[PDB]
Each structure stands twice: as structure tokens, then as C-alpha cells.
Design brief:
The structure is cut from a larger assembly and holds chains A (52 residues), B (66 residues), C (46 residues) and D (212 residues).
Chain B (H helix, E strand, L loop, with lengths): L4 H13 L30 H4 L15
Chain C lengths: L21 H4 L21
Chain D lengths: L6 E12 L5 E8 L5 E6 L8 E8 L7 H9 L5 E8 L11 E2 L11 E6 L5 E2 L1 H4 L37 E2 L4 E7 L1 E5 L4 E5 L9 E6 L3
Antiparallel strand pairs in D: 1-2, 1-13, 2-12, 3-4, 3-6, 4-5, 7-10, 7-13, 8-9, 11-12
Classes of the chains: A mainly alpha (52), B mainly alpha (66), C little secondary structure (46), D mainly beta (212).
Chain D binds 6 RNA strands through β2, α1, α2, β9 and β10.
Chain lengths: 52, 66, 46, 212
RNA sequence: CGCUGGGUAGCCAAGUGCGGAGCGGAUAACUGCUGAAAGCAUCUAAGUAGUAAGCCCACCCCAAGAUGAGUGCUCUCCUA
RNA sequence: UUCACAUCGACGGGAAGGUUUGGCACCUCGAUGUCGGCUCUUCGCCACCUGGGGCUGUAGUAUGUUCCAAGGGUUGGGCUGUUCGCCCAUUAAAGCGGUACGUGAGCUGGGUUCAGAACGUCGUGAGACAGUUCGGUCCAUAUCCGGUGUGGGCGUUAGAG
RNA sequence: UCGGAGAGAGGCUCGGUGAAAUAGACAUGUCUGUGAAGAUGCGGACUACCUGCACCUGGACAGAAAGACCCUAUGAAGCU
RNA sequence: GGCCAGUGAGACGAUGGGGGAUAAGCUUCAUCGUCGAGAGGGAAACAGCCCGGAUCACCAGCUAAGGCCCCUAAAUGACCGCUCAGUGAUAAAGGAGGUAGGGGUGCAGAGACAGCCAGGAGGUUUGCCUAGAAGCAGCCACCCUUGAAAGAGUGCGUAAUAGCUCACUGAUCGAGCGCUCUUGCGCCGAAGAUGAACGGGGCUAAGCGGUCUGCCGAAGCUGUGGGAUGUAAAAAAACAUCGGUAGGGGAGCGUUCCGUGUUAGGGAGAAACGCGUGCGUGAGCCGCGUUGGACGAAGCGGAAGCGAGAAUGUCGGCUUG
RNA sequence: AACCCAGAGCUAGCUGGUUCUCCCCGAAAUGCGUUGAGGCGCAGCAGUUGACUGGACAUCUAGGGGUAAAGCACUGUUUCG
RNA sequence: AGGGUGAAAAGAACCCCCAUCGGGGAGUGAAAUAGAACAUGAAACCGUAAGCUCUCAAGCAGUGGGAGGGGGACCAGACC
């Protein structure tokens, strides 16, 4: 939640799961909260492909 | 200046913890220093200015400070 | 006086959290479309 | 905040001034060991308040340490023991360079306040600290002079803080107020003042005008 | 203290001095000043005035262990 | 004198409080020591006085009632174990209560009327009375919290006065 | 009333000797609320640097001592 | 049916009642739910209220009750209305131009409401009483006329009058005004004794009602892997199950002695005592010891003075103060 | 109504206590009776071993009632013409 | 109520501290850490040394995560 809220525009943690299950990503198991700090450019690729 | 008190206090709190950082661990001090200038001109809404009491008390009875 | 105070387990039938909004009782969990089944967890390779 | 600079002097016994009208007044006699030289002024610019810092009791240099005597020789004055300031409103004209102020400023001002260390009485009981009453001396009683009850019952479960117990009574300074001045002596360096100052003859004594 | 008669310095009061001040701030009850929602009115909804032994400050003392640990002045760090 | 609402308010009704007597028997009987007094608190306002005000069948003095206000005060005694209460002299007034009697690991009398005795009454009697009277041991070096004083260490980013 | 002073034996300090009742372990705050309906131990807030010494005893439903009062026992005993 | 136990003090919550005062966390019953014997989550804490039934592991996911400002996980989410009392925890009778509506009924472009101004008179002081009662101390009805309208008067006042004034009508500006029911949320009523004491901070929304989408949220479910019980009578595999007090049944570990046993082993170190990067569901086993110095395993069996944290147990040792 | 010894390890419907592990199952606080009420006997409800059995849970239908509601036709009671 | 140094007292010649008690060397013994309080010696209890760490802190003292630091190491990622 604290990783996603760094965008500034009002994108919450609930909307990341809106467009995390609509775009069919089965069960990343909140280990994107691990590579959200071990690989912040890769979680920027995660979220920037959730947008598209 | 002209900011309401409690929502400013919550958004100062959410940075004073470190819950805007992906390095947030609630057992260490990952937060950030904040500075609040112009504390004399903090807005409040309704009738806080004449009805909200910051009372305190020492240990002995009859010391509750209005 | 003659107004009884509500003691324990009468305090619990009165001051428990009850969601008395007819909208928020109607809510079921969200439904996503079904997906094809995931493949095998591992495979013997010789 | 005081309404003006005061002096400090030592108590030298008590006596009775005979007024020429016929009355007999009990006066305390004040001496002055050395002039109350203004040593250090602290104004609004270089300090958060404004006060005039005087001292007293010129001594031998062996009696006084290096930071003390360095502070006093920063002002270019004599090495002296006692040292106190008076906080005063920002209209002051006081130079810290050896203003040997003379004692004429209190005679027309027939009201003065004094502060001083009262005489200590050590660890005294509740019968004299807080003016309690003693129990029955007889009739089979056993709580002679004792402190009695201390708190209430079960519901506090403790005793209230600031409760009147025995302890060390005297030793702190006190100020008694609006004490009318009397016959100064411009050659005996002695001021009569009708009252009773805190302490035995010998101690320091703040002598500063009133704050009414 | 054998029992009495007085007493300096201490301690004490019954004795001796002093204190309880403020056209300082904001209020509770109340009296109001203009004054609308109903072209009348009304202490109020805008603004605002007198005022309580009550609240705070001023008053006397302690007080930066106020860990938020203050401020100012001054002294001393040398030989291999 | 007219006049429900200056002041009382019948017949009735609605509340708050937990200070009396009660109801339940929920903690405590391998022990929560009752009533009164002394000492010493602290707190509530449902205000006796002191401060401000409204109304008065308030001419003024003194009031009657009521609003705000609990900072401070609320006497000395004869009777009784007395709480309460009566009376005297007053005082601005001599408030009512909570804090397990507020307070017996701070202190003393009547009492859960203990063991002796007597009077009345009850009982055939032993004995008994929410009847009366005389006499009748009350312990204690504070471990911790709490309190009042008073230090020592360390900290206050060099060390101090 | 209305306490006050003084003299001894203690109390305080030092040197010697040196127990006791008690004790689940104690890193043992206040208010307020809850709870077997009176909490340092649970909850929220506030307050408290650590640790001694000397006094005071409000609490630890403090120590004693399987409540003398009340009731139960198909208990015991004295007496009529 | 056979053998063989406990239990027979219950508690609260909903409904049906009696006793009470339709008072009690009160007492007694009847059906049910929970606790008892139930863990977890929500309820600030908190046996009985809601969800829910804990075999175990995972630094797995989806949910129920309940929540999404911060303390504390998730929406300072969206759109309609409401509240201005911090109501948001609280208790009523009753009062109220509070505010947002809703239903009725009555007046207006032939001027509707509010204010100013004008009139409000004649018989008449209706008849009784009183000194006077002239509408105003009261008793009885409580008129008609001019008219634009005036009531034996709406109140004050006067010795009584006189008089001030109103219901009603006339006149100027001008467009909404009454008076009743009613909800929603509010105000007062509403005051306790140690100290905010109502989770806290606080918030005019982060409060209250109506919908829309998602997320957080248990030890629930799902997934991946073990264990055991029942089928079951061998193994494998399958399905169901596996909270538990009083209690019942099944299976095991350990101790000292005895048969094998003058056992294997052991002054090249047995038992003890202390040790583990080992194995078991666990009671425990096995292994290692610069300590110690002579006994004694396992397996297959048997018998107990057989297993310790409780008895104001008890005996020694040693603390606290 | 002494003390010591013995019956006597009196008796106690009372109090405290009763020690290793794992797995499966799992209550009751009710009735009746009691010189009984904090005890006990039986029933109810457990465990285990059986023998007969074919039911449980949903839906429908049929029977007797006299509760809730209702009502004044009986028994009372009551307001008014 | 109080048993067990050794196999054999071979029970410590002599030197030092020194009034003794005791202690250290030396000597006996396989063992003197088997020394007459003498055989294995555990727990409570009292200690001393080494590593890390506590003086703004509310706690049935744990447990889950683990900052920083220390130690040996060999499956150096592991263990305490």
C-alpha cells in the first residue's frame, strides 16, 4: 500500500487489486510487496503494465 | 496558515511514521522529520475555538486545569 | 428513577457492532470470470 | 519582573527606634559590607530578558575560583562573593563598569520588600510545619503528637501527593513585603527598617522596592 | 537539677512585624447597543459593550531529569 | 382584598441520585474488625454565609423565591456511648453528603450487648430477652506501591564555577 | 484552650555481634472503565531517569489463625 | 440388552408465563442458542451477544460477522438528502417561529400579511346592588341604527368619570401570508461526590439515513503436504472424521528387582553426574564428556513401596526481610 | 470433666490431596423417593461389547385440542339512556 | 540425629607465614584438585572471571520478527 501510494495521483491499494485481477494475474501472493523494495523498477513495470 | 488541525495532524502522522515509504517496518524508525511553521494561524471548524478544552492534571486531586 | 442499567450480556446485545444498513447486508463477494486451469506443479525430466 | 534595581545587605541584630512623637518601634539594623557594584547587565539584544547583575562581599582572591574571578575581572571590578540580578523593564541605563551605587534611593520610597534565607529548623514534625493539633495527652490515649490519619479508605488506595508530612522546614528564601523604611545613616553605613528580616544576624538579604 | 528564686544566647507564643494587590485578560447568570429570518419586534443569527469571592495571569517559593535536559558570562586542555 | 404561576399549590403525572430503611444473595468468611469521638484529608452541589443578578403583594432597612458561582468559611458549650436531636451564648453563616465508622497495620468508650452478677418478665427447669445496670487484655521492627524531605550515580555530546 | 522548652533510654551515624514473623516469581505508577459486581498485572489516556537513606501508614481485600458471631453436620460434650 | 461410570449447586440471551413493584446480573418453570466443556475474529478491555466450530505445518489465497483518517489492516471512495447540538454514549413527561420536507384548509392584481395614521358612535350608566360600578367588584341576557365598522367591549387606568388601547373597517407602498396534523435529525428538560473518563487523538465529516463498486478481516473455506481414528479384517489407495471438563475405552515410554544371566560389554573406564547442529506423537532413546571409579545393557517375559508442583503435606539444606 | 498408654490406622454423608505419555468418544446440573436437601438409589443423558433392526433430515396429508387472537352465547363484573 | 581417605596411615620429615587454627612448597600415594570437615557431589544458595547489553523506563518478564555486536567454524546461507 505504501509502495503504490507513491504515485501521487489517487491510486489506492484497492484499485491495484481492481486492475490486478481484471487483467488476469492469478495470485502473486503479496510477494510483489517483496520485489516492491528488492526490485522497485520491476514493480514499476508491474504497475505500469497494470495501467495499460 | 488556514489549514484545519486534525487532518493536517493525520497527514503529518502518515509521514512521521513512514507509511509513505515502501521501506515501512513498524518496529524501526523509518519516518521523516517534519517542520510546521505558522502554528499561531491554524484553522478549526465549527466551535472548537471556545468549546474544546486542553485540560490536564497532576497527581493530587483538585488540580484539573481548565 | 426506575430505569434499569443494562449489565453484562445485556450490554452485549445493545452495544455490539451491528451493521443496520440494508445496503451493506446485500453485499456478496466480487466475481471475476473463470480462468483456465494452471498446469502441473512440476514434471519428471529424464 | 521587578519595578526597579535593589541592593543587598547583611542583618546586624535588632533594636528599637524611639520616634520623637513618643512611639517605640522594633527595627532591624542593616549593614553593608561592600557597595553593590553592578557587575553584568543583560539586555534584550544579547539575552532574552533584561536584568541588572550586582554583587557583594569583596574578598581575598584565594576565596574565589578562576571562572568566578574571570567573570568579575571581565567587568573590571573588585573580586566579590555574592552575585544576584534584578529583572527590570527595558528602560534601563546601567553600565556594568564599576557602578558603585550609593544608598540614597530607598529613603523617599517608604515601602520595600526583603528576601532572605530563613533559619533552618531541620527535619521537623507535622505539629510545627503545618500547624496541626496533638491528640489527647491522657484518657488512655496513645497517638500523642502523631500525624493521625493519612488518607481515605480503599477507593483511593494511595495517599494524595503534597500531603502534609514531616520534613525539612526552614532553609529556603522568603520575601516579606511592603516594609516601611526608617532612619538611614550616611556615615555608619546602616539602614533602620521596621520589621523582622528572615534570619539571624550575618546572612545575605535582598532589599528591593515593592511590587504592588 | 534535692527542693525552690531569678536569667544571657537558642527554641517558642501569649509577644513582635508583614500579607491577602490589580479602569489586568476572557467569561457563567444578567442588563444592554445597533440588528435581520416573518418592511413591527427581539442582547445575536454578523459585529460589540458593563460585569462574579468563580477561570487565567500578576503575587511568594521550588523549578531545564521541561531527556523538549534551556540561555548568558568566565576558566582549562600542556611535554614526549 | 381583584389576580392559577410575587409566594404556597390540593387530585394526579414524569424524572434524576444512590447519601436512609428495604429487596436479591453476586465477591469476601484457610478471618472484608461494626457505632461514636480525636487527628488529618480530599471531593460533589441538591447553597447556610460570602460575590454578581432577575422577580417581588420590593417605598427604604430587612426580605420571600430563584439563576450563575464550591475559591473560602461553616463557633464554644450543658445532656446522652451517642449519630440525630433539645437548650444557652453568639456569629456573615453555625449546609447536607461521598471517600468500607472516610480514617482502630494512627488512637480511645457504647458494642457482633463474650466469660461474673443483679432487676423485671418468660420457662417446670437448664437458661433466655434486637429489655435494663456494674465490671471487662486489643498486637505489630514497612518488603513493595503511595507520600514528604534529602542525597549518590549517570545523562544533558569536552569538562566545569 | 494551644501548645512550648529542657534532661535521660531508644530512634540517626560509625565499629563489633546479629535474628524474626512473612514470602508462587516479581521488570511491583495514577485516573477511568471493564471484569467473580473494590485491578501495579486487562483496556484507553496521562504521568514517571536509575537507586538509596530518614520518617508516615492509605492500599497490597497487609501478617496472624482452617471466623469465637450465622448456618449446615441424621457431629461432640456439659446441663436440665 | 451385558459390563461399567460420572451427573443430580447451573448461568445468561430470545419467546410463553407465575412471585415482585411486568424492579433487580432477582426467583421458579416450558421450548431454543451459547457458556459450562469452546479456542479464533468482531465487541476498547469483558463466560453466556453476532460470525464461527481449533489434527498439524506454510514469511499461502478467498471470505462470514464487523470495518476502510491516525493510533491499528483496508476508500480523507463515488452520488443523493440531512445534523451545526461535537448531537454523534446516554432517560421521560412536557415546551419550542430550530432546520429539511410532506398532507389538509383560508385569503389576494376588485391590494394578501406586518407597521404608521383615521374612525371606533346614538339610545346607553341594558335592568339589580353600591356613594360612585359610566365595559372594566359583580349578577341576567349580552340589542338594533349611521354605516366603511365598532364588541353592554381586549386589557390598563380613574373615587367614579374622563381617558390610553385593541378585535373590525378605511388609506399609502406592495405578491405572498396565515393555522393544524406530521415525520427525519436536532435544543432545553439532563445535576455527584479522586481526574478528559463517552477507546484516545480528533473530525461539520472521519456524523446520520438511501444505493454502486472494491479492499481489509478468523485457527471458517480453499490449495499444497504430513499424522491418527473408523470402514477393516495385512500393505497400497479411497471417503468420512480427528475442540473438549467429570468420565469411559485402546495403545505405549520410563524406573528397581528377577528368568535367560557367571548375558553382551566394562580400570583400553560400568553405574552416576553433565552434555547434544540426532531421532520420536510424547513419555523417552541413542551418541559425546581433560568429572568420576566397578559394575552391568538390549531383545524376549514377569512383579511392584513404579513416575511429583501442590495435601496451612513432611524431613534435611539454604534464602528473603 | 486432667495427663500418659491401649482399643485406634476410632469415626467423619466434611476439607485438602491423589504423581508418565499418545489416540478415539464424550456428558450432566432434570424427574421421582428419602430423618432428605452440599449425601444417596433408580430413571434421563456417556464409554465399550453386541443382538435385532431401517431409519434420520426435507416435503405433503390425516387426527385430538381450546393456547394466541377473538367474542359476550353461559358464569361473573361494569358505563350510560 | 550423626555411616563409607586409601589397597596399605604409607596421617605430611624438613623450610616459610605464624600465639594457635590454618595455608603454601617438599615428601608418601596410582590419585593430596583421596589431607583427616578427607569416597561419586546434583539442585536451591553464595560467589569470581569472560562475551553482549540496561540509567525517558510501565513489565506473569515470555514468544514471533530482529537492529547492532561477539564466538568458533565447514556443507563458509549454517550453529550458539
Amino acid at each position: 500500500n505504501a509502495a503504490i501510494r507513491e504515485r501521487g495521483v489517487y491510486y489506492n491499494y484497492s484499485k491495484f487489486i481492481h486492475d490486478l485481477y481484471k487483467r488476469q494475474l492469478l495470485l502473486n501472493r503479496k510477494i510483489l510487496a517483496q520485489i516492491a523494495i528488492l526490485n522497485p523498477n520491476c514493480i514499476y513495470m508491474i504497475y505500469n503494465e497494470i495501467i495499460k | 496558515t488556514d489549514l484545519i488541525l486534525g487532518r493536517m495532524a493525520s497527514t503529518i502522522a502518515i509521514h512521521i511514521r513512514g507509511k509513505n515509504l515502501a521501506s515501512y517496518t513498524p518496529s524501526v524508525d523509518m519516518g521523516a522529520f517534519v517542520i510546521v511553521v505558522n502554528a499561531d494561524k491554524v484553522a478549526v471548524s465549527g466551535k472548537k475555538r471556545t468549546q474544546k478544552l486542553y485540560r490536564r492534571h497532576s497527581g493530587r486531586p483538585g488540580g484539573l486545569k481548565e | 428513577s426506575s430505569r434499569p442499567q443494562k449489565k453484562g450480556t445485556a450490554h452485549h446485545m445493545k452495544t455490539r457492532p451491528k451493521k443496520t444498513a440494508r445496503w451493506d447486508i446485500k453485499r456478496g463477494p466480487a466475481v471475476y470470470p473463470p480462468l483456465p486451469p494452471l498446469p502441473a506443479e512440476w514434471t519428471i525430466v529424464s | 519582573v521587578d519595578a526597579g534595581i535593589g541592593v543587598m545587605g547583611t542583618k546586624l541584630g535588632m533594636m528599637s527606634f524611639f520616634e520623637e512623637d513618643g512611639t517605640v518601634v522594633p527595627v532591624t539594623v542593616i549593614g553593608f559590607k561592600e557597595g553593590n557594584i553592578v557587575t553584568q547587565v543583560k539586555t534584550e539584544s544579547t539575552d532574552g530578558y533584561n536584568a541588572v547583575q550586582v554583587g557583594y562581599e569583596r574578598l581575598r582572591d584565594r576565596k574565589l575560583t578562576m571562572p568566578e574571578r574571570g567573570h568579575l575581572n571581565k567587568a573590571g571590578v573588585i573580586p566579590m562573593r555574592h552575585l544576584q540580578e534584578f529583572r527590570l523593564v527595558s528602560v534601563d541605563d546601567f553600565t556594568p563598569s564599576q557602578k558603585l551605587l550609593f544608598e540614597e534611593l530607598f529613603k523617599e520610597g517608604d515601602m520595600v520588600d526583603i528576601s532572605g534565607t530563613t533559619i533552618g529548623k531541620g527535619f521537623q514534625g507535622g505539629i510545627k510545619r503545618h500547624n496541626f493539633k496533638r491528640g489527647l495527652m491522657t484518657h488512655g490515649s496513645k497517638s500523642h503528637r502523631a500525624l493521625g490519619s493519612i488518607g481515605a479508605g480503599t477507593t483511593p488506595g494511595h495517599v494524595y501527593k503534597g500531603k502534609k508530612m514531616p520534613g525539612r522546614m526552614g532553609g529556603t528564601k522568603t520575601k516579606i513585603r511592603k516594609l516601611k523604611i526608617m532612619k538611614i545613616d550616611t556615615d555608619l553605613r546602616v539602614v533602620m527598617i521596621k520589621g523582622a528580616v528572615p534570619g539571624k544576624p550575618g546572612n545575605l538579604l535582598r532589599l528591593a522596592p515593592a511590587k504592588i
